[PDB]
Ligand binder design. Structure first.
Ligand SMILES: [Co+2]
Lengths: 301, 306
């Protein structure tokens, strides 16, 4: 245990560093610290604006010889305003330019949601998605070698299946919120049935680490609650993207490999009440194709 | 060419008109197969459940021996019946079909229904076994890998069930063969098949006279205006929508008329009038809707396409 195998044959390291929009230098320093600590997987997104900063940190690691390019798994994501087929490869080339990379290991449709190119999330900018057309352009990016794998994020079982039905190249990954407070059992089983890998974002939830079931298991096994929450996801077969900028916790978040949650304690995760934390309010709207949260998540709520 | 063939997702060509076979009395179907191929049919559609594959195989042997046609010129389909869905039973059923047809390969092999009973039993509740379509499909895929079925597909699958299978399959179903005719136009599944690259073969393309599709006023009027028979109009409609058709005609003259569906067309204004024909599914699947079936309602079987 340290990798999962994608439907392309490629290995995805089971722990990656989740990134987000932060003050200058914060994410670049975290990426450097994480890779030095042993991380081999960095998850990015163009909408965070910080790909240039991450690219400088990767360049620093390469130049110091900490790792080589082929040692790392680098993900980024296509934002909602670049869904038009002609815009997809251009957006990927911008992410590659900023990361100073020749290819991504994984490129994801960030949301099943579309706005006009160059506009913000506001109802005058909403365009009905055409996921098959966007995917056809993702496939060309994959065929061209610019993305070793292509996938999606925030896709329900239903929307993932709708895409699998029309695709030539199967989505390799569905990256979704997943943690002991939102265990995604339906989508997990569906991903197993289709060979799609589930990557858990927000794997630490932060009330989730306060759950008595997690604190108790942590005490019994001599691990932190975060390590228990991360290990739970890995034992379910999911990669995880903990976000942290503290060197000590970055290193602890990696120690999730050589110990296991025993069956008796694993059973207790069914006692944790379930709630989706990132509900997607920003794209649920009377003028959105998703007028309710149930429409966006297809009942997975 | 001008829709004389359609291209499957395997790249193989399927002739757009084939002879639909059925369960008859000895000799009938073999004669029709011989007569159809002599008249120009290049596509013969069979099913093991009808028990007549040996008779069809003798007609094909006679066609090959007389030099009317070679094996490579014909597109031959058969189907896996509901009692052979167990993965061990799938290749054995295909080999029985091949043995009876006296063929080394089928051009197309279909799951006949999304439904399963114990091997060798009839459709009664005591014999039902919950389907495992992905597992059955996995065994179909092995037959495909081995070249015994050059294409594999399904029959009587709703858009939802076809989509559910497409999402797990390594080899995509090449065909969904369904009832489709002017009285049951299958617009939802037609659109879905286009979206997924699955070919739609229309069975009962004349509405099964042996009905009333051929007596619809819209069809009669279009037929008069185009100088063709109501049957030719019905068949041309399906072909113009991009579907193959499997008429069951045994009469030699109607068999030959069924091939005259290519050098003329239905104009855009008359095509629009097909919307006026009342819609009703004729093969409703009553035999597998049951309190003990996975399909408690007809709506569950057809996923709303009713
Ligand atoms: Co596929």
């Amino acid at each position: 245990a340290r990798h999962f195998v994608l439907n392309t044959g490629a290995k995805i390291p089971s722990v990656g560093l989740g990134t987000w929009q932060s003050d200058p230098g914060v994410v670049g320093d975290a990426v450097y610290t994480a890779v030095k600590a042993g991380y081999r997987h960095i998850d990015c997104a163009k909408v965070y604006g910080n790909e240039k900063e991450i690219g400088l940190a990767l360049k620093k690691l390469f130049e110091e010889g900490v790792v080589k390019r082929e040692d790392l798994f680098i993900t980024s994501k296509l934002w909602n305003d670049r869904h038009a087929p002609e815009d997809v490869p251009e957006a990927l080339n911008e992410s590659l330019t900023d990361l100073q990379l020749d290819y991504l290991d994984l490129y994801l449709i960030h949301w099943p949601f579309r706005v006009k190119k160059g506009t913000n999330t506001s109802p005058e900018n909403f365009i009905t998605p055409d996921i098959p057309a966007t995917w056809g352009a993702m496939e060309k990016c994959y065929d061209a070698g610019k993305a070793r794998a292509i996938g999606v994020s925030n896709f329900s079982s239903k929307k993932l299946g709708d895409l699998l039905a029309v695709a030539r190249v199967h989505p390799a990954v569905d990256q979704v919120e997943c943690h002991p407070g939102w265990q995604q059992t339906k989508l997990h089983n569906f991903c197993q049935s289709t060979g799609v890998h589930l990557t858990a974002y927000s794997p630490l939830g932060g009330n989730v680490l306060k759950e008595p079931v997690i604190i108790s298991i942590a005490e019994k096994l001599g691990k932190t609650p975060a390590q228990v929450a991360l290990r739970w996801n890995i034992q379910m077969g999911h990669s995880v993207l903990p976000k942290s900028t503290n060197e000590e916790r970055i290193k602890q978040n990696l120690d999730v490999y050589d110990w296991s949650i025993p069956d008796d304690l694993l059973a207790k995760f069914s006692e944790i009440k379930q709630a989706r934390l990132l509900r997607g309010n920003f794209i649920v709207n009377p003028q959105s194709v998703y007028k309710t949260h149930e429409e966006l998540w297809d009942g997975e709520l």
